[PDB]
């Protein structure tokens, strides 16, 4: 206990929307909001190398260039074992992918890091679920 | 340069469990882990409260439950026929005798989608239920 601070960087627009997020929700500061950001998504990262099942939601332009198989090299060398894919298109630019895999934790909080990162996708969201062999 | 810094005051406890999973999970720094935290939760905020009643709204449920508990199907298929969402697709895995893995594809108001989310994670049998709002981008 005590109190640090540390610096955090930012792209403008991600600042633009956690400034207007704050204005919109009466927040004192950036500083309270990021704290409460940080304390909920620490609480709700719910989970050995036991082999688990978990669902991966991908946001990310269809006519990007070679996206797909940006995405299929990654997932290769992962070490998940995917179950099933569904493509929903829900925009002119924008598909939707929920993947069921199952892999260890290491392996599984890796691949949505990894596809997280790639140009041209927008949204990489996990959900841990359960232990499954 | 195209990049601003700007100061998080904070309690140490909560930094030290920041900074574990920045070791545990091999994140570069402080600023990616934060930065991705942020913008998960604003995307998701935006989610909910811009153009509310718009029908048009995607999300995703993740469900587990014992699928072999009696009237537990029908009874959530009761519910989401009642909630006023659309189902898109849906996949079951059975992962054993007692569990089942469903992810849900819906679309609705927030308030619908969030509202049926609700009642399915209440049912008895229902161990899991956990929701990942989907949105467009420009």
Do not use: P
Not at 66 to 82: F, K, W, Y
Not at 83 to 95: A, P
Request: a negative charge; glycine letters at 4%; hydrophobic letters at 35%.
């Amino acid at each position: 206990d005590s109190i640090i601070r540390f610096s955090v960087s930012l792209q403008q627009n991600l600042l633009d929307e956690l400034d207007n997020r704050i204005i919109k929700n009466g927040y004192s500061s950036r500083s309270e909001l990021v704290r409460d950001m940080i304390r909920e998504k620490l609480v709700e990262d719910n989970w050995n190398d036991e082999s688990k099942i978990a669902v991966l939601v991908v946001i990310y332009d269809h006519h990007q260039r070679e996206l797909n198989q940006r995405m299929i090299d990654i997932q290769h060398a992962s070490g998940t074992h995917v179950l099933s894919t569904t493509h929903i298109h829900m925009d002119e630019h924008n598909c939707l992918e929920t993947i069921i895999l199952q892999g260890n934790s290491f392996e599984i909080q890796r691949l949505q890091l990894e596809i997280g990162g790639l140009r041209g996708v927008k949204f990489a969201k996990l959900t841990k679920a359960s232990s499954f062999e």
